[PDB]
Design a protein around this ligand. Sequence first.
Ligand SMILES: O=C(CCCc1ccccc1)N1CCOCC1
Ligand SMILES: [Zn+2]
Ligand SMILES: [Zn+2]
Ligand SMILES: [Zn+2]
Length: 459
Amino acid sequence: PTHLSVDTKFKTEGLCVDIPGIPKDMTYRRLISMMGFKMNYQVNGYPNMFITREEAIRHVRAWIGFDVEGCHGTNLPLQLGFSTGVNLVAVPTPLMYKGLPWNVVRIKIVQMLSDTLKNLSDRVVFVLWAHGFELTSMKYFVKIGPERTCCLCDRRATCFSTASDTYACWHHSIGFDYVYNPFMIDVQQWGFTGNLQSNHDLYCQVHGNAHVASCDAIMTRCLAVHECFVKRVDWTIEYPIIGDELKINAACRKVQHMVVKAALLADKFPVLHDIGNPKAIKCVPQADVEWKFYDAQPCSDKAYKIEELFYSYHSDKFTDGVCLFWNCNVDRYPANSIVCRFDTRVLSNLNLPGCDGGSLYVNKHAFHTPAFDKSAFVNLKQLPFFYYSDSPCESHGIDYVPLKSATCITRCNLGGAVCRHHANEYRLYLDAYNMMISAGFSLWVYKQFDTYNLWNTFT
Ligand SMILES: O=C(CCCc1ccccc1)N1CCOCC1
Ligand SMILES: [Zn+2]
Ligand SMILES: [Zn+2]
Ligand SMILES: [Zn+2]
């Protein structure tokens, strides 16, 4: 049981208004044939156009919500909506484009999917709330066959060109006109009572229904994301490396050791309350402090209420010392805290749009993160950049331009001139810090944090 069997049953109740008289008994095999596609008993890596929920979760980077609304069905013009906000109108002869034939519409579909997916995935997954028109319209822009490779590279083929009879991935498909071997999943097959808007609005207030095809496409992918990543969580599923993942994660570990070590030197807290990761390690292992851990998994729905995490009767007094919340998203942080909060609004290849203002952050694992709220940090301030080192000024073993910086907190800078070792280390740390901030993470600290207090750790 790897793929979705074509002999599985497809509930056709949701299809009978666009398609009256549809057989209640339907299989994927028969539905595909009804859609105008000939699978021709092909044992070449594309066993089914439709996929399982497990396969869709593993390929979430490829999800594109798709909806078709019949404006006037052979004689009538269709509105093609995608979760990218695009609305295309096809004639048979929230970006709303005017009526054009299928030969030009398919050119736009390939360009749009390619520009959206080239840096995220090796495929497309049309996430549907199937009523009929979207499945019947697929023959006008989709071609199927064996699994292929690109005409210009080793990546799998996702596009086809009738002009040249060639195949291409999302990176090399300029001027291609057909979507090749796409995937799809119908959310209605999951078992819902009622229409799309009623199920969507149960969990999300950020997406509305302007009554265009793209609005339903968005609500569809959002409802799919809530079901697969908000209400259900699976942090065991690994995801491929598609960007700066390894650099971002290494930067996060360097920043955390730096920021926490400096707070313990500047304010010498006797106890640190580490709230978050049940698998956490002491990020400053040589520190004197009483390190106490508290387990809390990443909240995917709503941010943790500080009352439920702390109270109900540990040192008991979280007011003693400092509380470290490294990616532990709470509604309002206590004033004595060190905090790393992921900003869900950040635009990147790792951050996919989520449910109720939240986002799906995919870095090794998929983490649905609640909406970034600036009010969570009223008792704290933004942590400013600084680099601190108490290592000896020894070069050992790139070239050099003298470093002049007020934020290089070192004995050499105290003494008047940054040594080459600390200048290399400072610039490497500044790069790691910038990496992490640009990845979307934000750093917050208690209002009394002052880097001026670190100069006296050199006596
Ligand atoms: O980057 C991460 C994972 C950090 C690791 C972790 C944090 C808290 C509990 C268990 C594990 N996230 C994205 C932002 O929201 C929070 C989770
Ligand atoms: Zn290619
Ligand atoms: Zn939504
Ligand atoms: Zn030095």
